[PDB]
Design an enzyme around this catalytic site. Structure first.
Site, PDB file in Angstrom:
ATOM      1  N   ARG A   1      28.468  14.839 -20.736  1.00  0.00           N
ATOM      2  CA  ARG A   1      29.434  14.304 -19.766  1.00  0.00           C
ATOM      3  C   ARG A   1      29.551  15.068 -18.451  1.00  0.00           C
ATOM      4  O   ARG A   1      29.397  14.475 -17.385  1.00  0.00           O
ATOM      5  CB  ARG A   1      30.825  14.146 -20.396  1.00  0.00           C
ATOM      6  CG  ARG A   1      30.874  13.066 -21.469  1.00  0.00           C
ATOM      7  CD  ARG A   1      32.120  13.186 -22.318  1.00  0.00           C
ATOM      8  NE  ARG A   1      32.059  14.351 -23.195  1.00  0.00           N
ATOM      9  CZ  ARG A   1      33.020  14.680 -24.046  1.00  0.00           C
ATOM     10  NH1 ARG A   1      34.099  13.921 -24.126  1.00  0.00           N
ATOM     11  NH2 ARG A   1      32.896  15.750 -24.829  1.00  0.00           N
TER      12      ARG A   1
ATOM     13  N   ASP B   1      33.370  11.183 -26.267  1.00  0.00           N
ATOM     14  CA  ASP B   1      32.202  12.034 -26.490  1.00  0.00           C
ATOM     15  C   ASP B   1      31.030  11.184 -26.984  1.00  0.00           C
ATOM     16  O   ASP B   1      31.130  10.567 -28.039  1.00  0.00           O
ATOM     17  CB  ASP B   1      32.562  13.075 -27.551  1.00  0.00           C
ATOM     18  CG  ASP B   1      31.449  14.081 -27.807  1.00  0.00           C
ATOM     19  OD1 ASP B   1      30.332  13.904 -27.286  1.00  0.00           O
ATOM     20  OD2 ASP B   1      31.702  15.050 -28.551  1.00  0.00           O
TER      21      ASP B   1
ATOM     22  N   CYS C   1      33.409  19.456 -19.898  1.00  0.00           N
ATOM     23  CA  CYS C   1      33.420  18.757 -21.173  1.00  0.00           C
ATOM     24  C   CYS C   1      33.330  19.764 -22.315  1.00  0.00           C
ATOM     25  O   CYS C   1      33.873  20.875 -22.232  1.00  0.00           O
ATOM     26  CB  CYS C   1      32.306  17.694 -21.265  1.00  0.00           C
ATOM     27  SG  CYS C   1      30.585  18.273 -21.140  1.00  0.00           S
TER      28      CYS C   1
END
Ligand code: NI
Length: 143
Positions: free
Chosen positions: A15, A115, A9
């Site tokens: 993530r 995000d 990420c």
């Protein structure tokens, strides 16, 4: 064929740490790690990431923010990135790795994992579910 997986990420604090741990859960025999194209190096997982994870019985403990590099990519057979924008960052940073890079949510109807950094808990619930669903499907494929 694909025995090593690098989950990627941006910060490597929301993530990918979650994607990494989900995949390890499902594919225990593989080397599965994670890094970030804008990583917060040596930082623990985000507090909200740990909240949503534990709430779902997932452990993020021991995690350490790690910077993505071309050299690191060399140790993995497959890269899974969260965002379309990440694909171009891989091409730019690791041209030789682009050929083994795919989206983490490749198998989902909508493929991008948004995000969640700095967002509310419900955005984290949402991102968690997407990562979980994407992970199950990636595991179905690599099995
Ligand atoms: Ni720092």
């Amino acid at each position: 064929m694909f025995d090593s997986i690098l989950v990627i990420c941006t910060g490597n604090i929301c993530r990918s740490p979650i994607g990494e741990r989900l995949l390890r859960r499902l594919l225990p025999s593989k080397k599965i790690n994670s890094a970030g194209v804008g990583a917060l190096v040596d930082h623990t997982a985000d507090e909200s990431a740990i909240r949503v994870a534990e709430k779902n019985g997932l452990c993020l403990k021991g995690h350490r923010g790690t910077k993505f590099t071309s050299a690191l990519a060399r140790q993995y057979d497959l890269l899974l990135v969260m965002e379309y924008s990440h694909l171009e960052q891989i091409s730019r940073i690791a041209p030789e790795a682009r050929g083994k890079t795919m989206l983490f949510g490749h198998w989902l109807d909508s493929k991008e994992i948004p995000d969640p950094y700095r967002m509310s808990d419900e955005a984290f619930d949402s991102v968690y579910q997407l990562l979980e669903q994407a992970s199950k499907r990636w595991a179905e494929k690599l099995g």
